[PDB]
């Protein structure tokens, strides 16, 4: 193919993760703008290409207002393009650092939307495996803007409650104890990450952190975290309750997305 290069004009960088760069682009025939996730494929292995197909496949399957929409998937000689609807408000990540933290009200609304996107994945038999603020995009800069779940690069399929060893993958500070313990795991790992995100929403820094990554993983596995003063003094216990239920070490004892959305604090 030259199907992308022929039909799209690439514009500015929007963002990047570990192995892609996302640029705004414009479709020539329409003048409509999109986000083109670009992956250099020269270096890539058979497994890496199957992962791209998997990404495109699962994104299409999960089409929904709170999930990024895939417009096309195109392989040229040296690059693959996943063309998505453009989400213009930037990463939740940015907005959090811009504000330091969200009020309980706004955190509550934001995590509600995140959990709605996650539950949408789970009730369609998908575990995302890489929930974090970099992978949640905002429809705009306005308060309570819609939240869009992105980056299905690691997403895989699972039946219901089932758990199996789906491999060592995710983003370190968001990884679940069970992934770190190399135990079989399932949808419930995304809920752990939502716990980490909600904690970040409330004080603007993560509950597990260490410069030594070996130590970070220790902390996660042990579920060692607390609510330090003065940051957390004004935060309601009910908010802290919801975090505790998500940051429950044993995944069998962990709150699901469905019953997270029913928490009084939500």
């Amino acid at each position: 193919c030259t199907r992308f290069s022929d039909n799209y004009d690439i514009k500015e960088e929007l963002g990047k993760g570990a192995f892609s760069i996302v640029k705004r682009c414009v479709q020539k025939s329409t003048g409509f703008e999109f986000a083109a996730k670009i992956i250099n494929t020269k270096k890539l292995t058979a497994r890496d290409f199957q992962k791209l197909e998997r990404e495109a496949r699962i994104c299409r399957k999960l089409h929904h207002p709170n999930i990024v929409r895939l417009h096309d998937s195109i392989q040229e000689e040296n690059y693959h393009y996943l063309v998505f609807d453009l989400v213009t408000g930037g990463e939740l990540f940015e907005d959090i650092v811009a504000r330091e933290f969200y009020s309980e009200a706004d955190a509550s609304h934001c995590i509600q939307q995140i959990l709605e996107s996650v539950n949408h994945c789970h009730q369609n038999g998908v575990v995302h495996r890489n929930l974090k603020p970099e992978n949640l995009l905002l429809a705009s800069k306005a308060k309570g803007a819609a939240v869009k779940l992105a980056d299905f690069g690691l997403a895989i399929e699972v039946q219901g409650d089932h758990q199996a060893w789906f491999g060592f993958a995710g983003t370190p500070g968001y990884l679940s104890p069970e992934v770190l313990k190399k135990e079989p795991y399932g949808k419930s790992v995304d809920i752990w990450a939502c716990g980490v995100i909600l904690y970040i929403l409330l004080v603007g820094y993560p509950p597990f952190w260490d410069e030594d990554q070996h130590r970070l993983y220790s902390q996660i596995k042990a579920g060692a975290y607390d609510y330090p003063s003065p940051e957390w003094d004004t935060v309601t216990p009910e908010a802290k309750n919801l975090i505790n239920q998500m940051l429950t070490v044993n995944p069998n004892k962990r709150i699901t997305a469905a019953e997270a959305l029913k928490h009084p604090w939500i």
Binding site: G17, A18, K132, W165, G167, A169, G173, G204, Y205, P206
Partner: peptide, 16 residues
């Protein structure tokens, strides 16, 4: 401790 971006990892190892 602060909020900083973090790269994705995938070491596979998935087992049939």
């Amino acid at each position: 401790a602060t909020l900083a971006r973090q790269d994705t990892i995938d070491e596979g190892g998935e087992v049939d």
